[PDB]
Amino acid sequence: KKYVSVRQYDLTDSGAAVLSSIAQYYGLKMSLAKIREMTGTDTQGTNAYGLIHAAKQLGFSAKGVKASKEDLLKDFRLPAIANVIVDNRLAHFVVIYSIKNRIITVADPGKGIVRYSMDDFFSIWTGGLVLLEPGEAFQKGDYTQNMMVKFAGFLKPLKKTVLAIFLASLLYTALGIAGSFYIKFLFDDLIKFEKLNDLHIISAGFAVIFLLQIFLNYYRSILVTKLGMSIDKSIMMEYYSHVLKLPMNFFNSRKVGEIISRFMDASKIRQAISGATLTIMIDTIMAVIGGILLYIQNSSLFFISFIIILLYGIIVTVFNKPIQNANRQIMEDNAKLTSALVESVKGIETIKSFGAEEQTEKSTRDKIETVMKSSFKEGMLYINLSSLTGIVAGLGGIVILWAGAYNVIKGNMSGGQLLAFNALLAYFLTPVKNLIDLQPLIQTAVVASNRLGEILELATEKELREDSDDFVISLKGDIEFRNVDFRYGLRKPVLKNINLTIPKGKTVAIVGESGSGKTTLAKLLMNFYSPEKGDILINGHSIKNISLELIRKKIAFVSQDVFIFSGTVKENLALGNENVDMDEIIKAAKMANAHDFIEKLPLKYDTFLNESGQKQRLAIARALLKKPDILILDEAYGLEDDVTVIIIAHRLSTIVNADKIYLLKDGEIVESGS
Amino acid sequence: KKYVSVRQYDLTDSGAAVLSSIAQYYGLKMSLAKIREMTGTDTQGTNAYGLIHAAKQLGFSAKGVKASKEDLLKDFRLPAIANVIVDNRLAHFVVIYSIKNRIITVADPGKGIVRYSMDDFFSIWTGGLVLLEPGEAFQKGDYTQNMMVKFAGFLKPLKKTVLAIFLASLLYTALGIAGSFYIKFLFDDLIKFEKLNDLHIISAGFAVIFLLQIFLNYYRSILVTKLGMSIDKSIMMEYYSHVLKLPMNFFNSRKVGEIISRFMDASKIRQAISGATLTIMIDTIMAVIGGILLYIQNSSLFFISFIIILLYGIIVTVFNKPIQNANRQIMEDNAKLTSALVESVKGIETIKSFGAEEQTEKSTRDKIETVMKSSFKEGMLYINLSSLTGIVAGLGGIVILWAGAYNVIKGNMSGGQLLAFNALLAYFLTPVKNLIDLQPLIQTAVVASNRLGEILELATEKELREDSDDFVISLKGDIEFRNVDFRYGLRKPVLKNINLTIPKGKTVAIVGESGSGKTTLAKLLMNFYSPEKGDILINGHSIKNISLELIRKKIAFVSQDVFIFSGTVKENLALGNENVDMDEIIKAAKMANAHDFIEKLPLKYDTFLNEQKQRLAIARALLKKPDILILDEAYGLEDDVTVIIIAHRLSTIVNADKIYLLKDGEI
């Protein structure tokens, strides 16, 4: 079978890509986003346990087996997952396929499919092997749609712009072709017969034709720019809205840059949707007309031009892949160099203390030299391609002139027809060249379309819920925990069996340990994460059966890492209010003992906030303004008697000792503390 | 008399830029980086106190005033500096030059010279008016130096690669000019008289000429690339090596991005040192020769081509400023949108908790539209430029063909000469086109060369160091502070008149809250910063009169903020020693009990670690063998005083030695 190699879309999904490659090899194709959701791919990477769990989900009978140096040459399962370590970095997942007297070309998701013969593979390969095997639950099918077809549906609303652009292109091509025959009339009738009167008329006519052509080009450019802008904005807003509607498992398993980088993928899709389609459907007809006209002028010169364009296309197609490979390596070296630079600049104190200026300088010099070597390789590939294209084009032009002169001498073609053919060459070479130049655009934009749209297939938070309602009054009753466990992805469990009961009151567990996970079950109570093997009861009959529009509405939270958004304090303190006046905000600040701080600012309640400047009190005011029934506090009045307060801290202080205190430490609560 | 406007090189040079503009107005030009250290510019910007202090140091008599909204109708001073709130989110410093009815001239470092209506100006002016007057001792003079010459001095080592490029370009131009007469020979001497054999001979000769031309183009393009890489590497290495020697004020007075981004300016400097100089040398002679040949062919066609290229030059150098302004506005809007996206993604928990998904979606939608507006602005400018250039080029070509045919009808000139002129037109229009297009490269690289030269002209740490003495004896005994007060720039003082003894070989500790600033004392001990007034004494021979190497080799300091460098743990633990190793660290592993922690990674290798951990820093300081050692929260050693441990909370260490409180309240 074909050695399918799925390539990474981000920097930390090697295991997901390898699992997708195995599934595709065995005949099962799925979105990579869903695959990495199944593997629990955190922002730090993926563990083998996640791959084992996800493979069994798809029906594979996975198994983690340790292997030794001589265990590579064994009659085990031919397609397998191997753990490798790249030069002076962390681990990495690759695929071994056949191992035929050499380590077969491994489907390395990072860089294409590299060979890695059996001379240095075992030097970078530990005994980490996964022995996948199809099972009963395996069901071959294609569970991902062609997402380029899903896009281009934004052309349908403004479909009158595409037609106008097509008509403008046709008129532009016709006018240019009509004006290309200036020299033929110039060098056959207007000069050979000395027609001074007709010369001015024909020149003015061709000038008017060219002016109309320029106006058509102007209009077409305006329309193309507007179409591209509209498609960009539509794709960007759709992706952003769907991301904002996504659950928290998606958000905490990716970096901010990783999520935001899909915004730059909305321009590549726009390119493939507008520019590629326009170029294809315009330049196809343009090239057909140009070829017909060239064959009308002279068959031999048309054949020569066809050979020229075939040679240019062959050269470009051959040089496409090495250019991409060289441009990938320069990015890695540049990233390494800038990482070294930033880590050296940030840690200037340590370098100065130990007098290591020269060592860091030498390391940076080595990094810069490697970057320059990669850049020179890329430049040399560009130079070779440009030289080959130049020799092809120049020899083609010279041979065209030579054969045209020979034909004119033989009497088979007019003198001005040679220059007419030369001028018409621009309408048969440029279209085919533009059509050939669509391979990088199409490939990169297909990759970008998959990358951007695999998120859009993810289920959001709203539709992941079960039935709801039957409890409309805001929850205020007793809180119960039923032996709930939480994994926080696919890592080691940190929420071993917990059972507790909070009967309203005002004070609950303050400290369990200095880093035991007191915030994580607070978020779990707020229904950010769904507990596994257990239920959360606030006597609202399995809160997972309550709408998020109320759960998030009547539960507060204030912690150390309070995030303040850039904006006026009036909006920030009352985010998402749409029913709150200035008096309510002032009162909420008053019971939060923060009105003095607000008045301390120059513009007071209209002061812009620069995300920095006490900021902790602001979240207290926001939570109090939310008017919740459960008000969770981390380390840091105006509240009703029947309002639950959590007051979680990190110091064994027992500030108030008002009510029962819990603590979890490592496992169960196993502490009454009442 | 000219309204001087100084562009700001970074995102926080507003006060420095306006003060430099004022200094240049009165005839005193100084390097900007030498100004945003007397102003005390920090990561958060400069205050009015910094501007006043720097003006006083420059000789300017400076004063501050909270001007009202009715006193602007007078003559305070002409070049006065004002504080304005740009948009409604950030503060900024501008220069108000002339006060006129409903029009005010404002030099804003971000934008340029702008005109604001008086009532329109009143909507953003939140009481600035720093008043500056020429002092009794204000000596004018140009204190900066040309930097393009300084970076062109990097070409002297390579005087046999530029010459080879020049010769290759000259012979390439000659071959192309010779080969452009193929069409003239074809349509004037061979087709007309039907010479078949001469056709083949001449075609083969011109094919050989073109092949030689391309071969000379392949060998010349490699040398240009090599020259560019050499110049870039030299500039980057020199800049980085000089930066790694600057004092600690430079590193904490600037963001990391403001230091890293100076690497990208080396590319611009190389582009206008190698590319611009080579183009100026080559294309000038190439255009002169091409114009000479065009005039030899026909005078009227040469005049028409000159008119065409002049119109193209005017059109190119009239759309110059609008394109730059549009690109700058697009960059600003893209930066704002990216910052909003980062804030929205990072604070997802607050948005989801408070149900602000639809509000933030609408807010981000209104920010993408603002980017699209400026993108369409640059698109309109580019399309107008392209349409005008295409009109000029096409109409000029048509007029050239028309006039050439008209001449061919007359006795002068011939059709073959017309085709030869059409071929030669590419060797006179392209050189002037390149010489006109060189302007943005020259401007951008002048800015870049200024940016790098400002840092490269800064005196290093060793340069400001005082003369050493014969105190090679290791620092040990009675660390004395005498009325020491410290400032972190021009901000509020952190230290004020602290005196303490630090008895030799004791367990002395200092206790205080977060705002006390004990790490400030620790950094002042290591000569990272110098005390504003006073000195530090260690049993005589005050700390300001001894070498820096002894300072850095004996005052090893470890705190909570541990930084692990990406590399070998052996090199990380023994950092900067470059001497005997691989054994002593083992004892340092045993002494600090770090051997157990590091003997668990299942590779026994460099342990890159991809950048708790205080133990590794502790073992790092053990190799230094320090006579003075400081801890924050993390022993043994010997009789020398190796514990100046910091203490934040009470009772963390109750009975070790004498305890110092904040501001040295009690011992």
Binding site: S14, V65, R89, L90 | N610
Partner: peptide
């Protein structure tokens, strides 16, 4: 030829 323990199996880190 031996299955990795649960503690060790999760120690098998992947990308980055």
């Amino acid at each position: 030829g031996r299955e990795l323990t649960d503690e060790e199996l999760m120690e098998m880190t992947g990308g980055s």
